[PDB]
Design a protein around this nucleic acid. Structure first.
Ligand SMILES: [Zn+2]
Length: 66
DNA sequence: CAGCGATAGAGAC
DNA sequence: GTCTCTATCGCTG
């Protein structure tokens, strides 16, 4: 609905992180951030969310031009 | 033109 | 030396 606010802040229902380069979701339609959706889907087992970090290593980019 | 999945790399001990 | 975790890329419609 145009309010652009499901609630307001699209939040990871698994780790509450507001900072992420790509928003993922759970096969059940629940929103996830980058690592939760990528890790939970790949591992398929509960996980000490304590591995979570508010600091993300910025990587380079295989970009250039041509 | 934008978004997503899958794969691969690096670090620490 | 090995294992694990996470992010970015390329491709398509
Ligand atoms: Zn998350």
């Amino acid at each position: 609905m145009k309010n652009g606010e499901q609630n307001g802040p699209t939040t990871c229902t698994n780790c509450f992180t507001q900072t992420t380069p790509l928003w993922r979701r759970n096969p059940e339609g629940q929103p996830l951030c980058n690592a939760c959706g990528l890790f939970l889907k790949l591992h398929g087992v509960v996980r000490p969310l304590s591995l979570k970090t508010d600091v993300i290593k910025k990587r380079n980019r295989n970009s250039a031009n041509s």
